Design a protein around this ligand. Structure first.
Ligand code: CL
Ligand code: CL
Ligand code: NA
Ligand code: NA
Lengths: 100, 275, 10
């Protein structure tokens, strides 16, 4: 086996605007194998209803997935993405940044 | 103005050699239009684009039969390979297949693809001539010898040069308002101070299609590669994509730097300077 | 339309 560590990006579909509904995305890519645990957190708590895209892979055989949910950003609420994989000793948590 | 259709198969084995997970997706350029998931309830080839639901019931039947036939063959190969490499019965192993075709603006065949991978690394691949194979080590070398003696590349070439091209044009025509359109990027620039001597200028590109885009920084007209970050093109979730480029600039020299955006949907390449 | 020629690798 060749195993690859996932790359994690947390961002919104549209530019963040406090008070307006949007979509919080977590894009995991460049990992192998495809079994992966991805949760979207709000202030540390797992968001319940979260869908994801169909499994696909790049030309280097590494998979990618898009985990998304509907949310409304505010000034004080925090959001993050928690990814667990066979290549990760501890689950990696990437915080959301409206500037990235 | 060339176009592509690609299919991505993935078969992941379960512990104890149980019923493996099989996922298949189809793309026309950067637009997914079909999907199959062995964990899905329908157990059918499901639509994923508006212009593909036009197909009749004879289409969805044959497409479901053929993706099932490949999954069952990948299921047998997974068990054959697990015993070949003496791999533990409590683990998971993956077989991936990528195949498709390319057409030019006139709709003629350009190039074909058919290549497999076992556990993340290349297994066997159909060369560009569509008549010979390039295989990996050991177990793949038996497959190459097996497929060569059976002339398997002939019918693989017939699909890539035939049915693949025929249906790629049909998809491109039925969904010309979706596939043959170019959504240009909506560009802007942000400023993020690092200290009293440096700051980060981030150059955004949002809502573009297709995903092929180029972002480059310049300082006084010269290509600026020092202290530059570029994230991969990420999907927005609505069919469009996002990408940004950053550069660390000294304070007071922000206007020395310009962002340059190249995309198919732009008649002229865009240039952005901090205002 | 998907591939209709199903090859057994082994
Ligand atoms: Cl990020
Ligand atoms: Cl197995
Ligand atoms: Na937008
Ligand atoms: Na896991």
């Amino acid at each position: 086996m060749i195993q690859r560590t996932p790359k994690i990006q947390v961002y919104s579909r549209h530019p963040a605007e406090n008070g307006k509904s949007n979509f919080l995305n977590c894009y995991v890519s460049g990992f192998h194998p495809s079994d992966i645990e991805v949760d979207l957190l709000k202030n540390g708590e797992r968001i319940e209803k979260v869908e994801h895209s169909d499994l696909s892979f790049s030309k280097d055989w590494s998979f990618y997935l898009l985990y998304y949910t509907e949310f409304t950003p505010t000034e004080k609420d925090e959001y993050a993405c928690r990814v667990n994989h066979v290549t990760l000793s501890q689950p990696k948590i990437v915080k959301w940044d409206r500037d990235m | 103005g060339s176009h592509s259709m690609r299919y991505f198969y993935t078969s992941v084995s379960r512990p104890g050699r149980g019923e493996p997970r099989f996922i298949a997706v189809g793309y026309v350029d950067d637009t997914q239009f079909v999907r199959f998931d062995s964990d899905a309830a329908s157990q059918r080839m499901e639509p994923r684009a508006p212009w593909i639901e036009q197909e009749g019931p004879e289409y969805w039947d044959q497409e479901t039969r053929n993706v099932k036939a490949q999954s069952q063959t990948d299921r047998v190969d997974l068990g054959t390979l697990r015993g070949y490499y003496n791999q533990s019965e409590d683990g998971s192993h993956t077989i991936q297949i990528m195949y498709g075709c390319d057409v030019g603006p006139d709709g003629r065949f350009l190039r074909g693809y058919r290549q497999d991978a076992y556990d993340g690394k290349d297994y066997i691949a159909l060369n560009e001539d569509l008549r010979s194979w390039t295989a990996a080590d050991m177990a793949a070398q038996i497959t190459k010898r097996k497929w060569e003696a059976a002339h398997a590349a002939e019918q693989q070439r017939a699909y890539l040069e035939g049915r693949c091209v025929e249906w790629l044009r049909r998809y491109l025509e039925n969904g010309k308002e979706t596939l043959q359109r170019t959504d240009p990027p909506k560009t802007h620039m942000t400023h993020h101070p690092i200290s009293d001597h440096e700051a980060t200028l981030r150059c955004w590109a949002l809502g573009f299609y297709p995903a092929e885009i180029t972002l480059t920084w310049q300082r006084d007209g010269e290509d600026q590669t020092q202290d530059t970050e570029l994230v991969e093109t990420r999907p927005a979730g609505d069919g469009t994509f996002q990408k940004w480029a950053a550069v660390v600039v000294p304070s007071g020299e922000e206007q020395r730097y310009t962002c340059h955006v190249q995309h198919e949907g732009l008649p002229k390449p865009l240039t952005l300077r901090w205002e | 339309s998907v591939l209709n020629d199903i090859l057994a690798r082994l």
